[PDB]
Amino acid sequence: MYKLVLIRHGESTWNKENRFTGWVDVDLTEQGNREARQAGQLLKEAGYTFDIAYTSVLKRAIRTLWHVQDQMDLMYVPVVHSWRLNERHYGALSGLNKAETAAKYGDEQVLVWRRSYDTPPPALEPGDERAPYADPRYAKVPREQLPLTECLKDTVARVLPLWNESIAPAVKAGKQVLIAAHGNSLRALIKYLDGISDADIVGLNIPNGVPLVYELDESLTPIRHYYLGDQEAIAK
Numbered sequence: 001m002y003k004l005v006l007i008r009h010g011e012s013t014w015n016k017e018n019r020f021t022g023w024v025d026v027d028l029t030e031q032g033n034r035e036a037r038q039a040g041q042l043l044k045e046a047g048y049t050f051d052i053a054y055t056s057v058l059k060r061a062i063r064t065l066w067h068v069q070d071q072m073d074l075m076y077v078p079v080v081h082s083w084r085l086n087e088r089h090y091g092a093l094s095g096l097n098k099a100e101t102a103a104k105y106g107d108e109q110v111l112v113w114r115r116s117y118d119t120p121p122p123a124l125e126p127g128d129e130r131a132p133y134a135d136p137r138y139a140k141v142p143r144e145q146l147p148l149t150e151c152l153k154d155t156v157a158r159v160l161p162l163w164n165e166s167i168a169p170a171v172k173a174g175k176q177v178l179i180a181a182h183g184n185s186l187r188a189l190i191k192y193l194d195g196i197s198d199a200d201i202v203g204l205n206i207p208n209g210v211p212l213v214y215e216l217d218e219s220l221t222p223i224r225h226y227y228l229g230d231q232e233a234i235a236k
Contacts, residue, residue: 001223002171002216005048006179006186009064010035010209018098022090023132023147028063035209036064040071042229043211051175052078054167056085056182057137064209065180083138084162087182091121091149094130115202116151123149152184152202159188168220186212193222210234 010032014021028036049072055065062081069075093101093113102110113121124131125148132138132146147154170177179189183206191201193214206212211228227234 002220003048004171004177004179004214004216005043005050006181006189006212006214007039007064007068007210008183008186008206008208008212009061009180010039012060014095015208020090020093020096020098020101022087022094022150023058024094024130025058026060028060032060032064032208033067036067037071039064039209039211040068043068044072046228048072048211049176050074050077050178052080052170053178053180054080054082054085054162055180056087056185057081057083058086058182061085061181065178068178068180080166082162082166083141084158085179085181085185086158088152088155088184089120089147089150091123092125092128093121094124117198117202118151118153120149120151120154152187153198155184156188156191159185160192163189163192171216171220193220194225207234 009028011029012021012026012032013029014024014026015032016029053065053069055061065079066075069077098110112119126133128148131148132141133143138146145158147158150158167177167179179186186206187201187204190196190204190206193216196204207227212225213228214225215223217223
C-alpha cells in the first residue's frame with residue numbers, strides 16, 4: 001500500500017478579488033498563508049512525513065508547500081517544480097472579475113468557459129503580456145507545448161506525463177510523496193487515479209488547504225482516499 005498526499009493551495013490575492021487566475025503568478029493572502037500552515041500542522045500532528053514533494057512553478061502553490069515544509073520540519077526534502085502542475089490556463093479571461101464576466105457574457109457562456117471539459121476559454125493573443133513565451137519558468141518548454149488557453153482536457157494531457165515519468169516511479173520506489181498544486185491540476189490527477197468520467201470530473205471541487213490522502217495499491221490503483229482534519233467542517 002502506498003500513500004500519496006495532495007494539497008490544493010490556500011487563498012490567493014485573486015481568489016480574494018474573485019478574478020480568474022490561471023497561469024498568472026499571484027501570491028497567497030494572509031488567509032492562504034494560514035491555511036497552508038494549518039495543513040502542515042495537521043500532517044505533522046497525524047505523523048505524516050515526506051521524502052519528496054511536487055509542485056507547480058506558481059508561487060501560490062510553492063509558498064503553500066513552503067509553509068507545509070516549515071511546519072513539518074521538512075525544509076530539506078527534494079522538491080520538483082513543474083509547469084506541468086500549473087493551474088489550468090485561463091486564456092484572455094485571466095485577470096477578469098468573474099462576476100463581471102458573467103454579467104457581460106451571461107452565465108451560460110461562462111459555464112462553458114469554466115466547465116466544458118473539451119472547449120477552452122478564449123485564448124490570449126500571442127503578443128499579449130500575459131503570454132508565456134518570454135517567461136523564464138517556461139524557457140525550456142517547446143514553444144508549441146505552451147498554452148494560450150486550456151480546457152481541463154488539455155490540463156489532463158499536460159499533467160499526466162509528470163505522473164508517468166516522475167511521480168509514479170517515486171511512489172513505486174517507496175518515496176512518500178506530497179503534491180502541492182492547484183484545483184485543476186489536482187482534478188486532473190484525481191480523474192486519472194479514480195477513473196472519473198469526462199462528464200463527472202468537472203463536478204469535483206477540492207477544498208483549499210486540506211490534505212487529501214490517497215491509499216494506493218501495488219498497481220497504483222486507489223484503495224481509498226480521505227481528507228485529513230475536521231470532517232464536519234470539511235463537508236461544510
